[PDB]
Amino acid sequence: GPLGSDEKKGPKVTVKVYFDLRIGDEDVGRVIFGLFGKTVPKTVDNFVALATGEKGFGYKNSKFHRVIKDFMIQGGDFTRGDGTGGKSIYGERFPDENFKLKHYGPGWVSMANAGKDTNGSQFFITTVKTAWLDGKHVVFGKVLEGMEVVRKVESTKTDSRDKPLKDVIIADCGKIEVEKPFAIAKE
C-alpha cells in the first residue's frame, strides 16, 4: 500500500445521482451513483438528464425489470418496462462513446445494448466483476453508497425469465452536485 504507487487510482466522479427504491409496497433505501462525466460526458449527461426528468421523461417510476443474482440488476426501460423500450436524450439510441472504463467489480454502472452503437436509457448495475462485457458495454459510473440496497434488489425473488415477482421501482431520483470532482478506485 505505498502511497506513490497507490496514487498512480481510477476516474473522477463529477456528479452524483440518487435512486430511492421500492420493492412491492416497501421502501428499501437509497442508492447513490458517482458518474464519470469527464471520461464519458455524453453517456453521463444522458443518465443524469433521465434521473432529473428534465426532458419531460425519464427514470422516475420505472422498474428494474431483470435481476440475475451473482450477475447484475437491470432497468431504465421507462416506455415498456421489459427491456424492449426506453430512449436517450439524443434520440432513440446513441453510439458507444468509448470503452475507457471496465466492469471492475461489483457496483459498476454500464449501458445495456443490442449491439454496437445502440445505447438508449437502459442500464445495469453489476453485482460481481463482469469482465466478459468489457469493450462491449459502455461503463459510466459506480455505486458510492447503498450497495446494501443493490444487494436487496439482487436477492429479490424472480420468475423463470428473471423478472422480479414484486415490482422493484424507482420511487424518486435526481442529481446531487459534486463541488470538487474526486477519483475512486478501479475495483
Binding site: 487510482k9 476516474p11 473522477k12 464519470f36 469527464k38 471520461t39 475507457k100
Partner: peptide
Amino acid sequence: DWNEDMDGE
C-alpha cells in the same frame, strides 16, 4: 485520447 487526471490510470 486518455486523460490521466480525469480517467485514471
